[PDB]
Symmetry: D3
Subunit: 152 residues, 6 copies
């Protein structure tokens, strides 16, 4: 039974993780199961929480399974950005789901982008959640104020 889970996991993780991959993983566990075994196995493979073979399954697959779960939840969120100056800037956006987008900006575009993003933070102030969220990062804003004026 342990071997079959490994083979099925090797198969599903052989291709790029996507938005169906976490549910597809759940289907493999359910196929192998017995509700009591599934819950044991979810704990084992997602959390590494409880034979030698089990340690092997955690090492190969816990991180890929957790990323599948992350993608299910927030795959479309920004994950990383790089920039190269050439005057224009070559920006690369990468999402939690691994997809990337190339975007060129000149100095005027970048400033306009900043203003757009600020307008959204200003709109957050009107919503009860957002205002508290901004206060949660009050120091990061304050850093911005120093940092931006220093540019000026």
């Amino acid at each position: 039974t342990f071997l079959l889970l490994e083979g099925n996991l090797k198969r599903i993780f052989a291709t790029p993780i996507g938005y169906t991959t976490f549910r597809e993983f759940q289907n493999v566990v359910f196929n192998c199961a017995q509700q009591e075994l599934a819950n044991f196995l979810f704990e084992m493979l997602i959390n590494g929480k409880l034979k030698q073979s089990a340690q092997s399954l955690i090492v190969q697959f816990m991180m890929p399974i957790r990323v599948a779960k992350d993608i299910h939840e927030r795959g479309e969120f920004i994950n990383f950005i790089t920039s190269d100056m050439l005057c224009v800037f070559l920006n690369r956006l990468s999402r939690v789901d691994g997809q990337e987008f190339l975007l060129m900006t000149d100095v005027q575009n970048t400033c306009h982008l900043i203003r757009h993003l600020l307008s959204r933070l200003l709109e957050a102030q009107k919503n009860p959640i957002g205002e508290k969220n901004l206060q949660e990062i009050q120091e990061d804003l304050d850093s911005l104020r120093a940092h931006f004026e220093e540019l000026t």
Copy 2:
């Protein structure tokens, strides 16, 4: 000859404009040509500058031809952004070439994005071109400073 140019243009603009489309347009003009006619026709169809049939060619195709040329030059530049607040924000980026990318951000991500973009403007100050570019938009920065502190 005028009719053939129209048919060839209808064909090439029947599919999405891409990065080969402007050169493909040039090939249609060269195929129809005689260097003296090509230059006349480039002026006619790109600039609308110099029978009834010619006006028809300008109306249908000048804008699609100019967009093809724009894309050739700067298709990968940012062109537009939209945002929807849900606390997270659903952002959509659109480039000059018409391609779009969906990107989710929460309030912390947005602030971090702002800081990254500012760092690039700060790096521009070190390059001789960028510093003058920033001075060219000195008011847009100054607006930012007001606008950001008002948030704080």
Copy 3:
């Protein structure tokens, strides 16, 4: 003013319609405006509802504007499907937003696909809206029952 709207519309519709295109259209109208003019112009260009020049704007752009609005609302909905039998079937799915996906199925896959889709209709019966929705198409289901048994 009428000419500028046309040029701006020719530009934005020169590239593929996407999820930002309807808001980008709104921005063109607002840029041209005066709240009273915008509302007049939205009525004119979306609904064709109220000089010669205005008729021209409706003819070229009302349908592309309405599709942009449709995509904004339901671009990801199924719009069309084709199938070619080769035993396997070459299926092509097209969405409201114009994007397509190729999917191969054999006879067993197709039956399994049907069962999956039925399970969802069965789940709809548990939700108050879905049960009434199914009753709204009670004849289409009844047709299915005849149609499927006739196959058997």
Copy 4:
């Protein structure tokens, strides 16, 4: 020689598996080869069939190699579908090649999709292969008939 095969395999499997990957794998084996060795090595790495090092090559690469071969043969076939009810349904299609497509359907669309898929099974009845194929799954159809009428 064993080490070189591993390095070359690590390289080719470092990027997403695609439709060229299986032939690219064959090229690595041929590059390392001697027809007699290639056939031994194909048996070893695809089937795990026949030193310690060989077991290592099977464990890391047999499944990725078999998936590459599967994709070569049927990468465009449906592999998985998920659905989320919101009344509309958020469906995700995943193919053997790992590519996915998002498709929204309401209750009417889903029924129409079912009818389309049934029409294809009905067309299969006209082709000599398809009729026997449907008879091969005669129970799955019969299950459908119960299952659909129970909905009604």
Copy 5:
């Protein structure tokens, strides 16, 4: 009836042409129809062959309909290539369906690409059709021989 065909065509051509678009066009004609009218209308709109309104339908839609049909038949065929020298070359491939691909090559890659393509022409010589095909373009090959040796 003529107006409805125009509206339906404006809608379907509002989004990028794809592989379902030609069949989707056929569905619009069939929806409007009467077998005798459909055949008249196919002749009218695909071939421009047989009131004022009909001429309008040919002008707006014949070329987009013919491209849809071309794509149905050979959308994946190469349509155009551009190259920019930078020593490396920036190549852009465009297909009949309008999709493009960027591919970088250095001088060695380009020669290797040529050899690969020649091997395929050499394989064509073994197939009865291909040998005659090569003879059909015997002059284009002969031009190559001059042209390549002149490089050497």
Copy 6:
């Protein structure tokens, strides 16, 4: 500290390698660092050059890290091509970055493609670098001349 690097690397390599991945890897090393440790760790993980744990990090990640670096440098370069004869040819292009493109060609297209690629080699002769590059592969060209005439 060694364990954290492994976990962070498992995470970033869980998704497809892209153009941001190498810089994202650098960020993980810098986050873990101390300039002296980073340089040690870059040598360790990119070059395998200098406890048991370190060998484990090289085995799992050196190749994926080197591919990320390759992609950063030349991800858009051609990496592989396959062809299937059907008279038309089904070609598949694969880049260093793993992305692929399907392109159909008939016998005439293939010859035209060859001519285009030769024109670029002929243009290279005008540039000081390219002429020497062609001389570097003088034998590969000479092979072409034999090989092409033999076809004729």
